[PDB]
Design a protein around this ligand. Structure first.
Ligand SMILES: Nc1ncnc2c1ncn2[C@@H]1O[C@H](COP(=O)(O)OP(=O)(O)OP(=O)(O)O)[C@@H](O)[C@H]1O
Ligand SMILES: Nc1ncnc2c1ncn2[C@@H]1O[C@H](COP(=O)(O)OP(=O)(O)O)[C@@H](O)[C@H]1O
Ligand SMILES: [Mg+2]
Ligand SMILES: [Mg+2]
Lengths: 70, 542, 281, 50, 105, 141, 53
């Protein structure tokens, strides 16, 4: 779904996966979408844009995911 | 009533033969088939003998029976011309397709003309600045000349012709005509909604202040419609040139589709094909059309035609024939576009009759020929740099490579019509800013700056203000540590009540496609027509 | 032999009874589930909607593919070419779009659903049968029509199977719903049309193709349009597929459809064998 | 010098192997286009007579 | 090659087996259908092959399948003319191949 | 223009007028050769006469040849360019020197009409497009 | 090329002499037979020559 693609690109283009080695990024994004709480995808789908309220709770939820390896 | 009415003799795709018992129409005469689903206009192309004409249909021929009455109009295809066509869309046979009512015609002109004579030619080479760096410098455009944009499917000759509409049509005082020949209907609706927002086309009561006539024969049309819609687009422009005395702009998107649609037709006219598969009459069909688009003594047409090269083959007989009909060719290259340089103009394949020192001045001319000198010298090194690298060139040729790698970024330019899909705003560059900017990269005034500072900027001012920004940005890695502090209580509520302020969508099961659906009852066995015309099943035999 | 005229121009059954059904290039079902029931017959050869009948492409068509929906975004009413070598993932981009419409159709409202048509021209009949088993075990077959003129079918059937499937997809466009048609190997439809043309002894042009092989695909792809608000506002999104030989996209049919469609999805063969899948150039 | 030449000539065999691999392709495209073009010239000359 | 498929299809459809079918030089199947098409006065397609090249190959290769009663697996020796894989005779054959076994010297 | 005749069968003219205009202009220039004076004829786009002659012959249903040209397209240009001679003293001593112009496609000198006129004419003036952009004008190879 | 060869064949056969035959462009013999070939109603061979080349 498009709301789970944009969080996986927000996790990568901002730099929340720079610590993760390139061998385990397919495992990292599968760990991003699973461990980030699923209510943030309902906000981004309904608002249809990363609202300035939402990227704070996105960046809060993106720093508390356990990325594999590293 | 029985005479002057032929019957359809035979139907071979877009080519219809009509047998006239009494008297035959002229060649180029237009006919009408009675009882078609649409208005089917045939145009007489050949007298085949035995009282049969051979015609080209302007719409589809599906549903034509070989006895159908065809009446002669006694004239060629006549389209409405005049100021009443401004702001209107016409198709090939002059019908309004914009749903704004009938066209308030000043006249109904035949679309078939003789080209204007030798005594009515004008020899007055004045420049037309387009604001495009590679066009204004290396192949400048004549103010009343024929201009070709040669391209290979996806290289940018509609974005270039829309930028020429954006740059020279607003600054023009006369009337534009757009002949969309064999292009996408999506682009004909994009251009229509753009010209209404821009005020070039006004609807309703303000229609008389429109400055553009659209004529559209797009690629959903049969080959007879695509073969004559360029002739309809000239006739609107030929009226403003001859009768109104105006300076006309004629934009013809893909004049190649005129040549292609005459090749889908001539296979069925029983001709022996010429080279690669085109009609034997390629050069005189194209020359019959292109000689009508001229500046005469009573008006000028600045025509800009896009020419499609069919498989990126410039030696294909349809682009090669068009090259002799133009004053300024702008050959666009698929390999320039793969470098990301836009507009993808080949600087060593685009020519103009204006690039002459007695027409554009010796200072503009000398920096054009010096820009083409170092780009040819970089092309002569292109395989030594490939198989041996830049390490083995001379120190006087590594200056040739580095300068030519700079001016081929400096010919690149952002467009005001490409700003939607590229994000960067468009840059109009004046003529003197291009001549002075390309003196500087030739003399060596900008050997300091990097190559990428020249990429996609307007002027030589903008390369200096981008060479700074490329060095402000590598210093900005050491700038500051961005921390977002104490904002969770200022204006951002929570995540849980942010769910409670979304609106739940009423998702509906049972998709319900049986709304307004008639559902005729198709029976099992094949229903056929018997000899009395009734719908009966198939008999059981073989 | 006696030839009977049926009385009408070449027509296929269109309507809501075509959903779920596998169909040959002429309309009659091949999946062995009986005749098409809730259906009516319309022409395969319809002139595309004009300039006034269209409006600008505003609404997104989510493919479900990350490299597509991020980098090459596709709107409703668009024609997007999927072009690349053999076995570079061209079908997988196309059938990820059909599967993703099953996931999106159960969450959007009724008038925002996308109904898919998959035209299989010149394919193996086994890969068509392995594709219906995929669309059935996913549940995508509820919103999918499947038109298939395979490699053993006659060349007029492969020429006409895109136009048959477009008329089945123009049912949804003309009634305000949204359609998604995939012509898998439109390269195999021009080869079948080249066969009919050379057997009709028509003069061949470049690569022995006829002169109207552009008009073969331009007539077909102009029917994918986003209609205006006074025509229901329904759309049809085309995904023509072109197979290139050795990555040469300056070929005749490849450059024909590039100059017809709006964008392209070049799937590179070098990225595909370096593990980068989908191998988006 | 001998070790930078050993690496600058490894970069030249693959540059002249990528150039050769791309020239093998467009020769093959020009080979197939020649056999198609000469054959269309023979059928067009035979259909004018037959 | 159709005489060979018919013997293979009896073991597939009547015996209900998993048949192998070896077509030694599928290219010579293509080349001989190219000659029959030329003797019947048909206009050659691109490079010089039959216009029906994809449906003469495809008429052969679509009978090689697994059905509910049995299977026919085909190992077809492939020749490539001028070592050009974009030649229309191997390019049409490669659209049907489910595997490739290269034997190297 | 005091010494120049200009024959111009342009692109809008019929194909038998462009076919016949090198012969029309040579007959006008042969007046000076046959009366003791000296002529100079320039057949600009003799590559476009052969295309006009190909259109006539394909539509008279004469069977096509190389690039669908007629078989006698060598004789189209060989009988035209042999009319440019230097006559003897018993015929006046007049002369006529010809400058046929042929356009090639991407420098393909091995094209069909280009091969014919190279073997008909005495000299060649080859003009290359890569020498044209190195500043060498006239781009003489 | 047959007219000049006939003069050379008279000096060889009847006069018994040794002859020198110089033929400038024997290619033009084959080229001239191609310019009449399709007008004698025969379909062309390879590159554009007569089938009887
Ligand atoms: N995104 C992907 N990830 C992993 N494997 C993939 C992906 N896409 C395709 N494949 C595999 O690679 C192969 C590519 O087949 P696919 O049909 O997608 O390509 P194609 O170009 O359509 O091939 P064909 O020319 O045979 O139709 C298939 O076996 C598929 O299972
Ligand atoms: N000046 C430009 N700037 C940026 N992108 C361009 C430019 N010109 C062309 N392109 C790209 O090239 C593609 C071809 O555009 P278009 O002109 O519509 O095709 P064609 O030349 O085949 O008609 C566009 O989709 C656009 O992405
Ligand atoms: Mg275009
Ligand atoms: Mg596929």
């Amino acid at each position: 779904p498009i709301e789970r693609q944009t969080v996986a690109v927000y996790a990568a283009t901002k730099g929340f996966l720079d610590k993760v080695r390139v061998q385990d990024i397919v495992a990292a994004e599968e760990a991003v979408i699973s461990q980030v709480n699923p209510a943030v995808f309902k906000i981004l789908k309904a608002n249809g844009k990363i609202t300035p309220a939402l990227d704070a709770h996105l960046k809060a939820e993106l720093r508390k995911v356990k990325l594999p390896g590293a | 009533p029985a005479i002057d009415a032929g019957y359809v003799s035979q139907v071979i795709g877009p080519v219809v033969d009509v047998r006239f018992d009494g008297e035959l129409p002229s060649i180029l005469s237009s006919l009408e088939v009675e009882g078609h689903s649409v208005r089917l206009v045939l145009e007489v192309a050949q007298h085949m003998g035995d009282n049969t004409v051979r015609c080209i249909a302007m719409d589809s021929t599906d549903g034509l029976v070989r006895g159908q009455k065809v009446v002669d109009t006694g004239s060629p295809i006549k389209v409405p011309v005049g100021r009443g066509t401004l702001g209107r869309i016409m198709n090939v046979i002059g019908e309004p397709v914009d749903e704004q009512g009938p066209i308030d015609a000043a006249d109904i002109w035949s679309i078939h003309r003789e080209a204007p004579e030798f005594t009515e030619q004008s020899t007055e080479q004045e420049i037309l600045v387009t604001g495009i760096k590679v066009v204004d410098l290396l192949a400048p455009y004549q103010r009343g000349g024929k201009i070709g944009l040669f391209g290979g499917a996806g290289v940018g000759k509609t974005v270039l012709i829309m930028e020429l509409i954006n740059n020279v049509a607003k600054a023009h005082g006369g009337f534009s005509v757009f002949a969309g020949v064999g292009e996408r209907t999506r682009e004909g609706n994009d251009l229509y909604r753009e010209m209404i927002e821009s005020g070039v086309i006004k609807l309703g009561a303000e229609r008389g202040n429109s400055k553009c006539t659209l004529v559209y024969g797009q690629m959903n049309e049969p080959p007879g419609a695509r073969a004559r819609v360029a002739l309809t687009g000239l006739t609107v422009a030929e009226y403003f040139r001859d009768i109104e005395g105006q300076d006309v702009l004629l934009f013809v998107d893909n004049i190649f589709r005129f040549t292609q649609a005459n090749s889908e037709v001539s296979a069925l006219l029983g001709r022996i094909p010429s080279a690669v598969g085109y009609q034997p009459t390629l050069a005189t069909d194209l020359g019959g059309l292109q000689e009508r688009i001229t500046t005469t003594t009573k008006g000028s047409i600045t025509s800009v035609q896009a020419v499609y090269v069919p498989a990126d083959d410039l030696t294909d007989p349809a682009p090669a024939t068009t090259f002799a009909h133009l004053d300024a060719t702008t050959v666009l290259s698929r390999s320039i576009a793969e470098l990301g340089i836009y507009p993808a103009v080949d600087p060593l394949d685009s020519t103009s009759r204006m690039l002459n020192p007695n027409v554009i001045g010796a200072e503009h001319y000398n920096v054009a020929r010096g820009v083409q000198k170092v780009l040819q010298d970089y092309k002569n090194l292109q395989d030594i740099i490939a198989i041996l690298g830049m390490d083995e060139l001379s120190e006087e040729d590594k200056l040739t490579v580095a300068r030519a790698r700079k001016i081929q970024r400096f010919l690149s330019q952002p467009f005001q019509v490409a700003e939607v899909f590229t994000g960067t705003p468009g840059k109009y560059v004046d003529l003197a800013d291009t001549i002075s900017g390309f003196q500087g990269v030739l003399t060596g005034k900008y050997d300091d700056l990097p190559e990428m500072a020249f990429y996609m900027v307007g002027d030589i001012k903008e390369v200096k203000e981008k060479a700074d920004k490329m060095a402000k940005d590598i210093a900005s890695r050491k700038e500051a540590d961005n921390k977002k502090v104490s904002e969770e209580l200022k204006d951002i509520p929570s995540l849980d009540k942010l769910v409670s302020e979304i609106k739940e969508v009423v998702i509906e099961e049972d998709d319900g496609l049986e709304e307004d659906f008639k559902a005729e009852a198709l029976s099992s066995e094949t229903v056929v027509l018997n000899e009395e015309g009734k719908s009966v099943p198939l008999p059981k035999k073989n | 032999d006696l030839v009977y005229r049926t009385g009408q121009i070449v027509n296929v059954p269109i309507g809501p009874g075509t959903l779920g059904r596998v169909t040959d290039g002429l309309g009659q079902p091949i999946d062995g589930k009986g005749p098409l029931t809730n259906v009516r017959s319309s022409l395969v050869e319809v002139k595309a909607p004009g300039i006034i009948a269209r409006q600008s492409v505003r609404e997104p068509l989510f493919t479900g593919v990350k490299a597509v929906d991020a980098l090459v975004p596709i709107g409703r009413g668009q024609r997007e070419l999927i072009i690349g070598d053999r076995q570079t993932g061209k079908t997988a981009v196309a059938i990820d779009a059909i599967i993703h419409q099953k996931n999106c159709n159960e969450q959007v409202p009724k008038a925002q659903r996308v109904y898919c048509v998959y035209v299989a021209v010149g394919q193996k009949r086994s890969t068509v049968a392995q594709l219906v088993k995929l669309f059935t075990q996913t549940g995508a077959m509820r919103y999918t029509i499947m038109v298939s003129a395979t490699a053993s079918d006659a060349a007029p059937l492969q020429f006409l199977a895109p136009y048959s499937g477009c008329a089945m997809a123009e049912y949804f466009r003309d009634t305000g719903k949204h359609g998604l048609i995939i012509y898998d190997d439109l390269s195999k439809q021009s080869v079948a049309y080249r066969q009919m043309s050379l057997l009709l002894r028509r003069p061949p042009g470049r690569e022995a193709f006829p002169g109207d092989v552009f008009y073969l695909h331009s007539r077909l792809l102009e029917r994918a349009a986003k209609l205006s608000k006074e025509l229901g506002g329904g759309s049809l999104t085309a995904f023509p597929v072109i197979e290139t030989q050795a990555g040469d996209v300056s070929a005749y049919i490849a450059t024909n459809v590039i100059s017809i469609t709006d964008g392209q999805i070049f799937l590179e063969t070098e990225l595909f064998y370096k593990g980068i899948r989908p191998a988006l150039n | 010098e001998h070790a930078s030449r050993m690496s600058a000539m490894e970069n030249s065999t693959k540059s002249a192997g990528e150039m050769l691999g791309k020239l093998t392709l467009d020769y093959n495209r020009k080979r197939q286009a020649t056999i198609t073009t000469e054959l269309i010239e023979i059928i067009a000359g035979a259909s004018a007579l037959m």
